[PDB]
Each structure stands twice: as structure tokens, then as C-alpha cells.
Design a protein around this ligand. Structure first.
Ligand SMILES: CC1=C\[C@@H](O)C[C@@H](F)Cc2nc(co2)C(=O)N2CCC[C@@H]2C(=O)O[C@H]([C@H](C)COC(=O)Nc2cc3ccccc3cn2)[C@H](C)/C=C/C(=O)NC\C=C\1
Ligand SMILES: CC1=C\[C@@H](O)C[C@@H](F)Cc2nc(co2)C(=O)N2CCC[C@@H]2C(=O)O[C@H]([C@H](C)COC(=O)Nc2cc3ccccc3cn2)[C@H](C)/C=C/C(=O)NC\C=C\1
Ligand SMILES: CC1=C\[C@@H](O)C[C@@H](F)Cc2nc(co2)C(=O)N2CCC[C@@H]2C(=O)O[C@H]([C@H](C)COC(=O)Nc2cc3ccccc3cn2)[C@H](C)/C=C/C(=O)NC\C=C\1
Ligand SMILES: CC(=O)SCCNC(=O)CCNC(=O)[C@@H](O)C(C)(C)COP(=O)(O)O
Ligand SMILES: CC(=O)SCCNC(=O)CCNC(=O)[C@@H](O)C(C)(C)COP(=O)(O)O
Ligand SMILES: CC(=O)SCCNC(=O)CCNC(=O)[C@@H](O)C(C)(C)COP(=O)(O)O
Ligand SMILES: [Cl-]
Ligand SMILES: [Cl-]
Ligand SMILES: [Mg+2]
Lengths: 207, 206, 206
């Protein structure tokens, strides 16, 4: 039948694993249903989002059915200094330095962090500003996601290194055409055997 | 003689550095005598063993005289998702999804983590499932051990990248035949100067 | 005009960001004025300096106008084990092993950690022994600094990899010949518009 995506703690007695969406407080963090964060000590998913400021307007977007490993960190665009000259943020200390407060054109802003659906993000991963992660990708533990990740690619390391693609490009096209995460959830439920077990040529044929 | 291997805190006034073996309470974690964990906040060495589940049956093995740096993490085989089709673990959330429960043969299982003797593991090292680390190797701090490490190798980085060998190939097998760590403690105590000073030819001829 | 460099918490209401120099109680750690540490939970910058023993005598020097990201750790030379033979530190456990203690001629010491002026160090950076980081460099977050960083270099990764230089070789030498961080503070304030916006030629004019 399925659990409730509005239930913050969907596992009996487990107070560390949280469905991300219901916990969110912040307008510009948008996470899909059923995506969870396995906490380390019960900290919120947002507590893992860092350098996130309304002034900049950048968003963190996560798809449906994503796995976020404990300690995964999201570094938003507020982290990058001005690099035209000296990087030191003089204006932060005020006392006559407030005058030199930069505008957003002066900063190296990279865009929103956007993570697709069915992404397995390993433990203690760090995601840097502006990176896109395709559907069905696997981020190895301890990875620092420095660049974009193709759908159904396995990556890892610091800086990020491409390892393998989970399936062929032909099977990858078929998974991206089917987009099971976007189907009505009665249909997800009566095909879950096939989604879990990766027999694309069965769902091939139902549609 | 030397310290008592069953002494959990062998350094007086030090509540952080622990001998691993006498703190172990799990039957799948075999650690040799004298190997120590220099902990950060006084936490257990077992606390660093993650995703370790009895139903998987995988073991963590560590030899004798190993230096395990603070924050070293062991990610066991229970951490890898099913990759046949969808990585998402539906069954954990039950409410009808418990039926789609995967078996040991459905998960990608890589085997035990086996660490050798006289290994120096750095601080904040993460060891991936199923990796083997030979005797007398050095793991640089912050390393992520994603593959096996040959005996007496210096390695580090993420992914792990080979740096160099500590001695020549010939000298490395003079050490692996000697196996000073497997000798009686009274033989070790009488030859500690050369074990520490590295005089392999002396130990060879002793 | 400007913040007082001897002020520990130079941002009103902010208990995390600290000017480093006025918090320093241990000699062999020399940090310049206005160099700050953005702490995660209000922890002292010193607490990030690990394996720092007076018996070894190495120093951590940091210039002025540096930004130290939260969680950045400095691994001092005391962290390196002896590598002639067994890296196991027998003498630490005492009980008859105390008399097999190394001298500093026996250990792989690598010198002081020296970081220049106007360096931007990312979050969770780990800096290893003996590394020198030039003026104006930028360290990517999560980087393990395994080697020296040229001035006005951008670097990152584990192990460290060179990414690119911030300006042309000629403009870099101009910034190094100007040394704005060492100018009298009244001189700096008059020219901060151009220090901050990268207009090197008018700075040379000034
Ligand atoms: C991350 C960082 C260095 C870290 O080592 C250490 C920091 F994380 C510590 C900290 N951060 C903040 C507070 O404490 C902080 O607020 N910001 C960090 C970058 C984004 C944001 C910022 O400053 O945004 C302003 C924006 C226009 C206006 O924001 C204000 O806050 N204005 C303001 C504050 C006042 C306070 C009291 C009285 C009057 C005031 C008037 N105006 C703009 C985009 C600045 C961008 C920039 O320099 N980027 C780089 C950053 C470097
Ligand atoms: C890391 C992870 C997801 C994380 O995002 C989130 C998790 F870490 C959170 C959490 N984990 C657990 C609880 O909370 C948890 O129990 N497991 C995680 C993987 C391994 C295990 C699991 O499910 O295993 C079952 C297995 C049949 C369970 O059923 C049993 O009947 N177990 C059992 C029976 C016993 C009988 C007698 C005495 C002791 C017993 C102990 N266990 C099988 C092998 C594997 C299932 C799978 O899909 N693996 C992949 C998952 C990956
Ligand atoms: C990092 C590590 C293992 C970690 O896994 C676990 C460790 F961090 C745990 C811990 N360390 C200590 C306590 O708990 C500890 O005391 N030390 C670690 C390295 C440095 C030090 C040590 O042993 O030092 C002595 C030294 C002669 C005797 O000790 C003194 O302190 N003597 C002394 C100090 C004086 C100071 C000023 C003036 C006169 C003095 C006279 N005598 C010498 C240099 C030994 C160096 C060595 O074997 N290096 C390797 C390191 C291994
Ligand atoms: C997020 C969770 O539920 S599991 C915790 C983190 N573990 C990992 O990311 C393991 C990393 N494994 C790999 O990178 C391997 O190369 C792989 C082929 C995917 C197995
Ligand atoms: C066991 C402990 O806690 S000692 C602390 C860990 N520190 C380290 O291992 C330092 C990392 N650096 C290296 O290993 C270098 O590659 C080396 C060339 C061997 C020196
Ligand atoms: C120290 C602080 O205030 S923010 C922490 C550091 N930030 C980072 O490491 C972001 C990583 N990205 C980069 O450095 C890029 O390569 C950049 C040079 C800006 C282009
Ligand atoms: Cl320490
Ligand atoms: Cl030194
Ligand atoms: Mg690398």
C-alpha cells in the first residue's frame, strides 16, 4: 500500500531517519515525496544545508525517492567570496567596512543545486554550488560532487571522478522515458517488483 | 614484557586511546592484540563500525600491533543498496512495502574487511566494504580505501591512489616471512630494537 | 576605522566567527591580525591544531587577512610515526617499552606549516605537516593539502590538485610586490575599494 510521505519519522522506533519534505521550513528548499535523510543524531536535513541565504535566491531541489546518507552536506552559493581582487569579506566586520558590501553581480554564483529522482547519495557526501545530479545516479560515500552527474552514473572521489554507468545507454534511455517516480502511486505500487528488480522489459510491455 | 593486551586504557591518565580487542563485544569483529584506537571523544571502536549487521554475516578483521587513527570509519557490507533496478529501499518503511524484502544474494556483497598486522591507519580514514589491507601498510590521513592495499604500501587520497612502497620488493618479503608480530612475546621483546629500527637483516639472521 | 584585531568576536551577535590571534594561548602558533576562524559550534581555533607538541618544536604560522573555513584542521609533525621499521609506537604503552623511545632525528619531521596573507581556506580543509601556502591562494572546501600551494593559486581535492591561477603571472607578481596586507592600516583603508575590486594598476599608482 505504501507509507505516508507526510510522516516525518516513517520507521517505528527509528528517530534518526526522516522523510525530508514534511520537515522543510524554507521556501527555496524543495524536496520530492518519499526522499529521506538518515540522520546521524537526529539533526534536520536543513541543518545540513549550508551557506543558504534568501538574499541570493538560490534553490536546493531534490527529486522523489532519493536516499541521502548521514552527514551529506549541501554547500549553497553564499559560500563563494568575491575573487576580482582580495577575497577577504571586509564588509562582514562593519566599523566603516560596511560600505564595501558586494552586489550579487560581483559574486561567482553558480545556480541552484538540483538532484533528480531515485538518487542514492552516499554517506558524508558534500555537494557544491550549482551541480546537477541526474536521475538514478549513485554518489559514492565521502564523495565531493564538484561537477554535474549524468543520469544513472556512478561517481565518487574528491574531486569527483566518473566510475561507471549502471546500465547501458539504451537501457538508460528506457528508464528515463518511463519515469516511474512520476506515475500515479497505485501504478508504482503494482509494479514495485519490476522497479526494484530492474526488469525494464516487463514494464516495457505493460505500457 | 610490555603492556597488558587486555588493558583497555594502557596509557595512564589517557581516557581516549584504547586497546581494541578487550572492548569488542561483537562476535564478527576479530582484532589482534595490541592494536589500538586513538579515539576522539572517548567513544568505542565499535562505534566506528557502521552498517554492520548480523544477517549479512560479514566480519571485520584486524591484525596485531595496528595503529588506528581517530575517526577512522569502517563501512561494512550492509551499506550498499540493491542496484538491479532501483536503489531505493522500499521495505524499510513497511506499510505494505515490507513484502519486497531483498535476500543476501540480491544485494552486492563484497566480503570481509581484513586488515593486516603492524598497519598504521591515518586519522579520519574511511574503509570501504570488502577491501583487504596487507601487513605493514600506511594509510595517509583522510584517505578513503576503495580498493586493496598491498603489504608495506603507502597510500592515500579519495579515491585511494598508490604513493610508493616502503622498502624494496625483496626486503618486503624478508618482512612477510619473518612475521615478527606472530612470534612469542618474549622473542619480540628481545628484538624490539631491530623491529623498531627496521634492521631486517639482523632479524633475518636471528 | 575598521574592526579591532584584538577583539575575539568582531561580529555583534555572532559567537562563532572569531579573530584568531587574540584567542592564541600557546607559543609556536603565530597568526596575523584580522585572520579569522568561522567555527561550527564556537570551538577555539587552537582545538583545530592537532598533534602539536612542544618537544618537537614545529610552528603553525598564518598571515594577516586570512579566512579559515569551519572545521579546517592542521596536522602538525607530531602526527608522523617512525618508519625505519614498525610504525607501532611501542614506547607510549610504557611497562618496560618506555626505553625504546625515538629522538626527532628518527622521525619524519617536515617543518612548520606556513600560510601567507590573504588566504581563503575552505570548509573542512585538512592541512598536513610542512606545507607552505602562498599569499592570496584559494583552497577548495574538503581539500587535503598534501603539498605546497603557489601564491594566487586555486587548489582542491584529496590528494591536492592544481586547478588554475587567479591572474596572469605578471599581475600576480604585481600583487606580491605590493603586499597590501603589510601596509599601515590607514593606507589600507584608503585603498580598500581597489584592493577588493582587483584594480591592481591604480594600487601601484597609489
Ligand atoms: C561566507 C563568507 C565568509 C565566512 O567565512 C563567514 C560568514 F559565513 C559569516 C557570516 N555571513 C553572513 C553573516 O555572517 C552573511 O550574512 N552573509 C554571508 C554571505 C551572504 C550574507 C551577506 O553578507 O550577504 C550580503 C547581502 C547583500 C546583505 O546581507 C546582510 O547581511 N546585510 C546587512 C547586515 C546588517 C547587519 C547589521 C546592521 C545592518 C546590516 C545591513 N545589511 C552579500 C550577498 C555578501 C556577499 C559576500 O560577502 N559573500 C561571501 C561570503 C563569505
Ligand atoms: C543502508 C541501507 C539503507 C539506509 O538508507 C537506511 C538504513 F540504514 C536504516 C536501517 N537499516 C536497518 C534498519 O534500519 C536494517 O535492519 N538493515 C539495513 C540493511 C541490513 C538490514 C536489513 O534490512 O536487512 C535485510 C534483512 C532481510 C532483515 O530482516 C531480518 O529478519 N533481520 C534480522 C533477523 C534476525 C533474527 C535473529 C537474530 C537477529 C536478527 C537480525 N536481523 C536484508 C539483508 C537487506 C535489506 C536491504 O534493503 N538492504 C539495503 C539497505 C541499505
Ligand atoms: C602520533 C603517534 C601516535 C598516536 O597514534 C597516538 C598519540 F597521539 C598518543 C599520545 N602521544 C603522546 C601521548 O599520547 C605523546 O606524549 N607524544 C606523541 C608524539 C610526541 C610525544 C612523545 O611521545 O614524545 C617523545 C619524547 C622523547 C618523550 O616525551 C616528551 O614529551 N618528553 C619531553 C618533552 C619536553 C618538552 C620541552 C622540554 C624538554 C622536554 C623533555 N622531554 C618522542 C618525541 C616520541 C615521538 C613519537 O613516538 N612519535 C610518533 C607518534 C605517534
Ligand atoms: C546512503 C545509504 O543508505 S548507504 C551509505 C553510503 N555508502 C556508499 O555510498 C557505498 C559506496 N560504494 C560504491 O561507491 C561502489 O563503487 C558501488 C558500485 C556503488 C557498490
Ligand atoms: C594513528 C594516529 O592517530 S597518527 C595520525 C595520522 N596521521 C597520518 O597518518 C599523517 C598522514 N601522512 C602520511 O601518511 C604521509 O603520506 C607520509 C609520507 C607517510 C608522512
Ligand atoms: C571559507 C568560506 O567562507 S566558504 C568555504 C569554501 N568554499 C569552497 O570551497 C567552494 C568551492 N568552489 C571553489 O572554490 C571554486 O572552484 C571557485 C574558485 C569559486 C570557482
Ligand atoms: Cl589528537
Ligand atoms: Cl618539524
Ligand atoms: Mg582525488
Amino acid at each position: 500500500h505504501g507509507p505516508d510521505p507526510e510522516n516525518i519519522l516513517p520507521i517505528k522506533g527509528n528517530r534518526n531517519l526522516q522523510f525530508i519534505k514534511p520537515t522543510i521550513t524554507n521556501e527555496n528548499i524543495l524536496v520530492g515525496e518519499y526522499s529521506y535523510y538518515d540522520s546521524k543524531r537526529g539533526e534536520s536535513f536543513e541543518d545540513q544545508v549550508l551557506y543558504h541565504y534568501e538574499v541570493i535566491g538560490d534553490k536546493l531541489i531534490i527529486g522523489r525517492f532519493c536516499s541521502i546518507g548521514p552527514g551529506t552536506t549541501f554547500i549553497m552559493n553564499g559560500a563563494n567570496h568575491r575573487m576580482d581582487g582580495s577575497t577577504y569579506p571586509f564588509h562582514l566586520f562593519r566599523m566603516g567596512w560596511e560600505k564595501y558590501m558586494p552586489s550579487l553581480k560581483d559574486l561567482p554564483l553558480k545556480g541552484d543545486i538540483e538532484i533528480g529522482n531515485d538518487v542514492w547519495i552516499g554517506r558524508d557526501v558534500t555537494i557544491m554550488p550549482g551541480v546537477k545530479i541526474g536521475d538514478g545516479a549513485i554518489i559514492a560515500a565521502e564523495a565531493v560532487v564538484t561537477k554535474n552527474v549524468a543520469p544513472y552514473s556512478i561517481v565518487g572521489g574528491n574531486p569527483l571522478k566518473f566510475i561507471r554507468k549502471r546500465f547501458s545507454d539504451g537501457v538508460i534511455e528506457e528508464w528515463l522515458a518511463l519515469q516511474w517516480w512520476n506515475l500515479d502511486m497505485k501504478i508504482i505500487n503494482e509494479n514495485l517488483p519490476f522497479i526494484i528488480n530492474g526488469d525494464i522489459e516487463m514494464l516495457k510491455r505493460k505500457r
